[PDB]
Design a protein around this ligand. Structure first.
Ligand SMILES: CCCCCCCCCCCCC/C=C/[C@@H](O)[C@H](CO)NC(=O)CCCCCCCCCCCCCCC
Ligand SMILES: *[C@@H]1CC(=O)N(c2ccc(C(=O)NCc3ccc(Cl)cc3Cl)cc2)C1=O
Ligand SMILES: *[C@@H]1CC(=O)N(c2ccc(C(=O)NCc3ccc(Cl)cc3Cl)cc2)C1=O
Ligand SMILES: CCCCCCCCCCCCCCCC
Ligand SMILES: CCCCCCCCCCCCCCCC
Ligand SMILES: CCCCCCCCCCCCCCCC
Ligand SMILES: CCCCCCCCCCCCCCCC
Ligand SMILES: CCCCCCCCCCCCCCCC
Ligand SMILES: CCCCCCCCCCCCCCCC
Ligand SMILES: CCCCCCCCCCCCCCCC
Ligand SMILES: CCCCCCCCCCCCCCCC
Ligand SMILES: CCCCCCCCCCCCCCCC
Ligand SMILES: CCCCCCCCCCCCCCCC
Ligand SMILES: CCCCCCCCCCCCCCCC
Ligand SMILES: CCCCCCCCCCCCCCCC
Ligand SMILES: CCCCCCCCCCCCCCCC
Ligand SMILES: [K+]
Ligand SMILES: [K+]
Ligand SMILES: [K+]
Ligand SMILES: [K+]
Ligand SMILES: [K+]
Lengths: 274, 282
């Protein structure tokens, strides 16, 4: 009766694996449908202005312009002053590896390995302590409004649902809405790009297409410090939200398992009623 | 649920915060010393080839050569191959790459080599991440549970064999954890680095560099397996997906162990300064 638990474990893992595979298949087709047509437009614009630059500059040779493009690309393969190396050290221990700057000295790659293996756990302790502090702050606030609801409202199991909505709306305004407003003004980004950056950063995905403080424009003395502070409390908030979404998925997984139970049981007595 | 414990918790957070700032300061200075000479040297060489192209083409407005470079670089962010010899460009958002891109999202290994530029694609990317990340966490937990029981069965075979001469109290736990490290290193780090060096044509260090940056979910994007335009063995990208699956589970356990070690050493250092704070030069 001990291998039976392992078989039931495998049964759970294999169905979750298939669901994840389905998730990747659906997402792939959607990202294809959304991003492929746009890719057509910008690759026609590079070929028109390529030949246009040849046309606009007939002195430039075809053979000598293609030789220039390759070493530009080869060059893509100060960026390391104390400010950026500090920021880079942050992108490592937070796993938000934006990658806009990354070590290419083979000594720098060795240190990057050592720095990450010790940095990730150490920063995890900090992120846990900040989340614990933010948890108690919201706890008193949510406890006060709980005790106001118990007065007019009769029974519980409903106040927790209301309370979780406050956590989202406040957390969205504090950690998503407000910094996105400042990001669009300071960084000159679109409103959607600001939300896009906020979520991509706080989920630790860190694509690198958008980086606050990354462009070489003038920045106020307090700006990057408060963004560091936003990173700290923001990662704690998104960690709780992602865990809550996971808890919702666990409930939906049981309701769907129960829903499919009611369905085939009904369809069984009907095929029997034949 | 408040009281005195919250004050003692806050005191710990502030010391860890200061230590993290120190960690960031020390790391910044080290990366400064290592990476600054290489970037200064090669940016003087680009100015050498700058002026060479500047002199060779006076018809080019020279100040307008940066005007061409900006639209090259801005188009490189979308990933273009603008050569008359290679005017046949293959898709970066085919079903294979969009599958790979969806993986880099839900695993948070956001390599970023390709990223959505359609404003609709960014909205979907937000929804895809907010639901995908928690869902993939369940899979990664199940894989870690599977690897845990396999290592459990493996360690179970030797469990009753350990009853030998020198029967131990607290020492047998350390031995088993050493097998977990060395075995796990060859399976999930050393061996895939070997294949990465052969198939992808990377250096031995770059293969290890890629493995750790990928399996820690940092994902810089300077190294991506299967990203370069090689034919690939057809089995390659599937088996790399499997390495990603069990590799992320393994590195999760290793990172948590390092944190447990850091908790022990933090108390040893806290006690070491304690005997120091009391003695004050005998
Ligand atoms: C460090 C700052 C100075 C910058 C430049 C110094 C070179 C880097 C220091 C590594 C040891 C020097 C000896 C030869 C090194 C090179 O051949 C090179 C190392 O990247 N490749 C190897 O395969 C090394 C052959 C050994 C084969 C074992 C596996 C290869 C892993 C790379 C070295 C160990 C990494 C340690 C990670 C925990
Ligand atoms: C090198 C050029 C440059 O300006 N740069 C840089 C420095 C500092 C920051 C920064 O502090 N961004 C805010 C921040 C802090 C921490 C984390 Cl984990 C993320 C973010 Cl967005 C950005 C860029 C260089 O790298
Ligand atoms: C578009 C061009 C291309 O070749 N490409 C691509 C496709 C597939 C992979 C890949 O599978 N890499 C292994 C892998 C799988 C999953 C995760 Cl999360 C990471 C990694 Cl390294 C790479 C590149 C394009 O994007
Ligand atoms: C598909 C068969 C499920 C039988 C296993 C017992 C139900 C519990 C499944 C809920 C998710 C697994 C554990 C949660 C991960 C921390
Ligand atoms: C953790 C506190 C560090 C303060 C922020 C440093 C970020 C990188 C340095 C760049 C300039 C310093 C702050 C000026 C804001 C633009
Ligand atoms: C508890 C609220 C935190 C919100 C602060 C995050 C702002 C992100 C960008 C920093 C801009 C500096 C000016 C903001 C002044 C409040
Ligand atoms: C690494 C350098 C960080 C830049 C230091 C500025 C931090 C926040 C600005 C504080 C302004 C000082 C005036 C006092 C009023 C708050
Ligand atoms: C424990 C076995 C797996 C059962 C999973 C139930 C369905 C999967 C969850 C649904 C995925 C996202 C739904 C959000 C609405 C589109
Ligand atoms: C994955 C994209 C949206 C979610 C809808 C499809 C999820 C797969 C449904 C599988 C149903 C099986 C439930 C398990 C109980 C027997
Ligand atoms: C996915 C159905 C099986 C193969 C059908 C051909 C679709 C595209 C050809 C090669 C791409 C394989 C799909 C990449 C992601 C699994
Ligand atoms: C295929 C792009 C142009 C076709 C005509 C316009 C359709 C609307 C744009 C496609 C979806 C992006 C916006 C959706 C975000 C709410
Ligand atoms: C050391 C044995 C532990 C189990 C891990 C081996 C993978 C197979 C799991 C057993 C369930 C049968 C698999 C179903 C066929 C794909
Ligand atoms: C059929 C040839 C595969 C090459 C296509 C590139 C994408 C890789 C497809 C593998 C997908 C299965 C792994 C899913 C594990 C979560
Ligand atoms: C051994 C657990 C003691 C309880 C400490 C309260 C929770 C904080 C976690 C560990 C305290 C700092 C660890 C040092 C980080 C390197
Ligand atoms: C709760 C007290 C703060 C914990 C201080 C951490 C001590 C770490 C000692 C240094 C050991 C070398 C590892 C690098 C630092 C984590
Ligand atoms: C890479 C090393 C970074 C940090 C190295 C040590 C930092 C501070 C450790 C000593 C602090 C003693 C705490 C005692 C509190 C009572
Ligand atoms: K993480
Ligand atoms: K990246
Ligand atoms: K990450
Ligand atoms: K990342
Ligand atoms: K990343």
């Amino acid at each position: 009766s001990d291998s039976a638990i392992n078989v039931m474990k495998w049964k759970t893992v294999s169905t979750i694996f298939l669901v994840v595979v389905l998730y990747l298949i659906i997402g792939a087709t959607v990202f294809k449908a959304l991003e492929q047509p746009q890719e057509i437009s910008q690759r026609t614009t590079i070929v028109i202005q390529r030949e246009k630059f040849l046309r606009a500059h007939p002195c430039v040779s075809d053979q000598e312009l293609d030789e220039l493009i390759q070493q530009i690309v080869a060059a893509i393969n100060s960026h390391w002053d104390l400010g950026c190396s500090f920021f880079f050290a942050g992108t490592v221990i937070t796993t938000i590896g934006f990658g806009n700057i990354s070590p290419r000295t083979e000594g720098g790659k060795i240190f990057c390995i050592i720095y990450a293996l010790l940095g990730i756990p150490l920063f995890g302790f900090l992120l846990a302590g900040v989340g614990d502090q933010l948890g108690t702050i919201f706890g008193k606030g949510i406890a006060k409004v709980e005790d106001t609801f118990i007065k007019w409202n009769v029974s519980q199991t409903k106040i927790r649902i209301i309370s979780t909505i406050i956590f989202i709306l406040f957390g969205c305004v504090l950690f998503v809405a407000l910094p996105a407003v400042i990001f669009k003004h300071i960084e000159g980004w679109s409103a959607l790009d600001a939300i896009y950056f906020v979520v991509i950063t706080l989920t630790t995905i860190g694509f690198g297409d958008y980086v606050a403080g990354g462009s070489d424009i003038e920045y106020l003395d307090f700006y990057k410090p408060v963004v560091w502070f936003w990173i700290l409390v923001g990662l704690a908030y998104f960690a709780a939200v992602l865990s809550m979404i996971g808890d919702w998925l666990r409930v939906i997984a049981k309701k769907t398992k129960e829903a499919v139970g009611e369905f085939r049981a009904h369809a069984a007595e009907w095929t029997a009623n034949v």
